[PDB]
Design a protein around this ligand. Structure first.
Ligand code: G83
Ligand code: G83
Lengths: 181, 181
């Protein structure tokens, strides 16, 4: 898992920030240009707090699949002149299944912490926060509040964003290449 | 830092546990035979909770240097028939200074989380919890309550146990080979 950790630390240094919304504090991953992602439940307002700084939300697409089903990601275009290093090349075209993964968190609660969550398997459909939801990836780790937005990685791969947990497993929504125009 | 992470994950799997004392929940590192360490302020009682299990404390040496000064470690001999894999070979004879380190935490608050804290320099004397204290190692990371007992490592090396923080830096007490008979 050494190279996975090394990839994660560099990714999070390069592309991540800490976001507060009216619904809480989350890890946020910048993808390319000016577009970042959060879990849908961050319910980002017209302004967010990004590393303690007010930033405007030029647009915010909550994502769903063709059968209108919940995917639990919101994409945001940020009013800022700096551009995110482009990490679309790191995003798979479909759900990745991995034997060793790292979940990386960047909040006030969990500043730069990394968790080896072990095996990620494709879980697909889950009833999450009561909402039917697809394209879920599952790892057996006791995830808590304060970990949403967590970025799930393996060597060379950005697999998903942490969005939920039942107290015993956690679930990332798959960050698919095609979500990004 | 890849190999440091890989060393840490294996160390913590092999030698660490979660301890609750009347003073809180800590990460605990088993050293050899039946002897483990905590920060002195864990103030371990005649019984501890180790991974949720009552265990007796056959002896408990709080450590100080020759000038009676605070080192902020308590060594404990545990009433249990399992033996700790012997990691004394991993403990330096004097304070190690490192450019990249990992701090590894194992509590209910922070279960298996790892933090790259970067550069560790020898700090020696610090006024800690108001107590004069020596053999301190310092890293620039915002450490919090719930991280004491944290094990600070680099590839192949167990450097110290996390014992304090001022909100901006954290401090480990050096885990020296000679402390272990
Ligand atoms: C991220 C929020 C955060 O970081 O806080 C910012 C301050 C949080 C992380 C998970 C919650 C507990 N552990 C986690 O890893 N996610 C959520 O809170 C998420 C919110 C949400 C909102 C809107 C739509 C979907 C999701 N909700 C869940 O993860 C839920 C929480 C829950 O209700 O379950 C427990 C109370 C933890 C048991 N998890 C969930 O729905 O699991 C499936 C389930 C629940 C009940 C019965 C059967 C199956
Ligand atoms: C570990 C306890 C834990 O994990 O809880 C179990 C439930 C905790 C971790 C540090 C505290 C805050 N951040 C940390 O990384 N350690 C302590 O609480 C430790 C207790 C202690 C007890 C007895 C003897 C020595 C130490 N105390 C400290 O780390 C103190 C805390 C403090 O008083 O400072 C702040 C309030 C955080 C600012 N740190 C300290 O003394 O720093 C030096 C200092 C303080 C004030 C002025 C100048 C210099």
């Amino acid at each position: 898992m050494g190279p996975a950790f090394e990839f994660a630390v560099a990714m999070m240094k390069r592309n991540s920030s800490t976001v507060k919304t009216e619904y809480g504090e989350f890890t946020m991953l910048g993808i390319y240009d000016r577009w970042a992602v959060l879990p849908r439940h961050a319910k980002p307002g017209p302004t967010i707090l990004m590393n303690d700084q007010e930033v405007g939300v030029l647009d915010a697409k909550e994502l769903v699949d063709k059968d209108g089903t919940n995917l639990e990601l919101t994409l945001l275009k940020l009013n800022r002149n700096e551009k995110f290093r482009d990490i679309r090349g790191f995003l798979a075209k479909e759900e990745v299944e991995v034997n060793e993964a790292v979940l990386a968190i960047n909040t006030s609660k969990f500043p730069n912490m990394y968790i080896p969550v072990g095996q990620v398997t494709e879980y697909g459909f889950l009833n999450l926060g009561g909402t039917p939801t697809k394209r879920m990836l599952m790892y057996n780790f006791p995830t808590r509040a304060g970990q949403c937005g967590g970025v799930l990685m393996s060597t060379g791969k950005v697999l998903g964003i942490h969005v939920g947990g039942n107290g015993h497993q956690g679930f990332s929504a798959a960050l698919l290449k095609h979500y990004f125009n």
